[PDB]
Design a binder for this molecule. Structure first.
Ligand SMILES: [Ca+2]
Ligand SMILES: [Ca+2]
Length: 156
């Protein structure tokens, strides 16, 4: 129950898998696809890429990013990323996933973001809990993107 703050924001959705291997402390995130993304270019679509941050206690510990897909609101990525998180800390971290529009000049604006892990709620918490309940198994799930203002207030 609960969560769902981004549902009516019409920013789009992201699908990714999570896998956690406790013995090795290996956390794997596969960015699969995004859909229904907000348009971010005047006269056009968006040039989306995805950023992943590992966080704890308001600090960005590690940063990864996908390749950029041009001129689409429904990008497919299928790009894998791994992090090292010891099992004693896996319930105390966040994985933050942000979709942005690449612009050749100017700060790249976020479309929206979500996080899973500590302090996550709703479908975000469910995905994380499913990952932890099933060591070694990747679990794929869709998530609704939420405005950065809101998500960042929860992460800070
Ligand atoms: Ca733009
Ligand atoms: Ca752009």
């Amino acid at each position: 129950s609960g969560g769902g703050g981004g549902i009516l924001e019409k920013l789009g959705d992201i699908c990714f898998s999570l896998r956690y291997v406790p013995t090795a402390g290996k956390l794997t995130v596969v960015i699969l696809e995004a859909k229904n993304l907000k348009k971010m270019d005047v006269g056009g679509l968006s040039d989306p890429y995805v950023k992943i941050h590992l966080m704890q206690n308001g600090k960005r510990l590690k940063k990864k990013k996908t390749t950029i897909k041009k001129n689409t609101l429904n990008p497919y990525y299928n790009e894998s990323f791994s992090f090292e998180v010891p099992f004693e800390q896996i319930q105390k971290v966040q994985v933050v996933v942000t979709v942005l529009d690449y612009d050749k000049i100017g700060k790249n604006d976020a479309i929206g973001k979500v996080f899973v892990g500590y302090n996550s709620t709703g479908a975000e918490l469910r995905h994380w809990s499913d990952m932890l309940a099933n060591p070694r198994r990747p679990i794929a799930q869709w998530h609704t993107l939420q405005v950065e203002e809101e998500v960042d207030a929860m992460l800070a």
